[PDB]
Design a protein around this ligand. Structure first.
Ligand SMILES: C[C@H](C(=O)O)c1ccccc1
Ligand SMILES: [Cl-]
Ligand SMILES: [Cl-]
Ligand SMILES: [Cl-]
Ligand SMILES: [Mg+2]
Ligand SMILES: [Mg+2]
Ligand SMILES: [Zn+2]
Ligand SMILES: [Zn+2]
Ligand SMILES: [Zn+2]
Ligand SMILES: [Zn+2]
Lengths: 95, 88
């Protein structure tokens, strides 16, 4: 995988441990640490022609920002879990 | 507000990187500044603040679409608005 892929993969389990446990400030810290690095990757790898899987992950991210802004923590947690599970699998397709 | 202060610090870091031509760092710092703005806004939320919040929303949507022309345009605009917000 590209070096940015290896970098992203390293943080994914920890985001899900935090989210599952309802450590929502930790989930947000870890996501925000990831934000520039997922976007750099997504631009280089997916661009304006993302696969439906990659695009669903990135739409999840957009919708996480919107939920968090609205304080809708139920949606922050649900979207974070679903988006994480898809990202983990996206980064395994070469497996 | 230490969030305000981090933002101010990051704005300066951006101007230092841009003076050196460290453009990957500029773009990275601009992206660090997105969640940090939202945290600030969600802690203090002015019309200008609201325009900055929308600028980040729109940058994100443009990036998700691959409209890097719009990412570039909106980022430039939003950066200036933040500088102005913290210059009052
Ligand atoms: C996970 C969530 C949903 O299940 O509603 C979702 C919908 C559309 C795009 C991304 C995520
Ligand atoms: Cl984030
Ligand atoms: Cl956003
Ligand atoms: Cl963004
Ligand atoms: Mg590791
Ligand atoms: Mg798997
Ligand atoms: Zn984000
Ligand atoms: Zn995104
Ligand atoms: Zn945002
Ligand atoms: Zn961003």
């Amino acid at each position: 995988g590209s070096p940015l892929a290896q970098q992203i993969k390293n943080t994914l389990t920890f985001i899900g441990q935090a989210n599952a446990a309802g450590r929502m400030d930790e989930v947000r810290t870890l996501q925000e640490n990831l934000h520039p690095l997922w976007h750099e990757y997504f631009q280089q790898t997916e661009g304006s022609g993302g696969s439906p899987l990659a695009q669903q992950i990135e739409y999840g991210h957009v919708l996480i920002h919107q939920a968090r802004a609205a304080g809708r923590m139920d949606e922050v947690r649900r979207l974070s879990e679903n988006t994480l599970q898809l990202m983990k699998e996206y980064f395994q397709q070469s497996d």
